[PDB]
């Protein structure tokens, strides 16, 4: 794939209750594009969690540079554990969809 976004860390483990923040970095070439945050449900069915531009427990925040983005689940629950990714959709010039590698979130029990 050409100029895909990266999604990090590949493995993020948090205690239930905390916030969990991923970093999706996309260096866009010509800004007619949208970024989407996905969670992969049973046997590869994708669920859209949020999208930039535009549940409130899933927040996407654009950082000062034109590359880095913060995707955070607020107060992660045990069943937030799963597989996530970010996809970049360039609308023009020349339509193209590029996904990141999959990252795993693990939410552990509080003591």
């Amino acid at each position, epitope marked *: 794939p*050409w100029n895909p976004p990266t999604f990090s860390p590949a493995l993020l483990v948090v205690t239930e209750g905390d916030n969990a923040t991923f970093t999706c970095s996309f260096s866009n070439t*010509s800004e007619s594009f949208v970024l989407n945050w996905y969670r992969m449900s049973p046997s590869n069915q994708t669920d859209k969690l949020a999208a930039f531009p535009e549940d409130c427990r899933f927040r996407v925040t654009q950082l000062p540079n034109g590359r880095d983005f913060h995707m955070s689940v607020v107060r992660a629950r045990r069943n937030d554990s799963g597989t996530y990714l970010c996809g970049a*959709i360039s*609308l023009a*010039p020349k*339509a*193209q969809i590029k*996904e990141s590698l999959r990252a795993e979130l693990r939410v552990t029990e509080r003591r």
Partner: antibody
Amino acid sequence: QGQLVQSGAEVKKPGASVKVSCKASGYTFTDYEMHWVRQAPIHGLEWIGVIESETGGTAYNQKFKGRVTITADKSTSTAYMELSSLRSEDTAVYYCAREGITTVATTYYWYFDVWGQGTTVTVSS
Amino acid sequence: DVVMTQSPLSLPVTLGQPASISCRSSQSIVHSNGNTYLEWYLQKPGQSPQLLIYKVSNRFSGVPDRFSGSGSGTDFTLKISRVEAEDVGVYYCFQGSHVPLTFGQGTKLEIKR
């Protein structure tokens, strides 16, 4: 391949709005983007904008950005195109045209392999 | 915006003879991925435009052998080896490497009688 059928001719007063549709058949709708292109003698062929059906994302030519809205209904394989604040110079033929979305499974090197038949919009008092 | 200029604007040609249309871009139209999305479209009279040539020199499916494209930098050319009757209409070059996407102004190919 596949097909694109657009709504019939339209006539509107200066300052009104028009909404023209574009129905797809014979191919997978979400595998493609839908562009809109204008053709008039004073203007030639000019690109208006594009929509990606799945995300609803749109990109517009700065010339029309602010008075054009492009929408798509994936369930009915129909794209739409709404021009507001019509001027006499908006009189033209309006085409919709698909573009293959490059993915990791498929690469598209071309833009407009299938076009609608065109929709005539006349703006006059 | 990248301005695409065609030459000539009217092309009368005798049946069986070659034809040539020039397209010039006001700047480079190399895409950020390295590809040059220069295209040639033909609008037969009373019909919609149809794709002839993609990516500077690649012939689209169903397009006859006699059509060919070439170019480099800002200069591109469409060649017809032997003009046939079904080849009349308006020819447009198009660039898709920069937003906004722009077409040339058109070249009307007519039969010289």
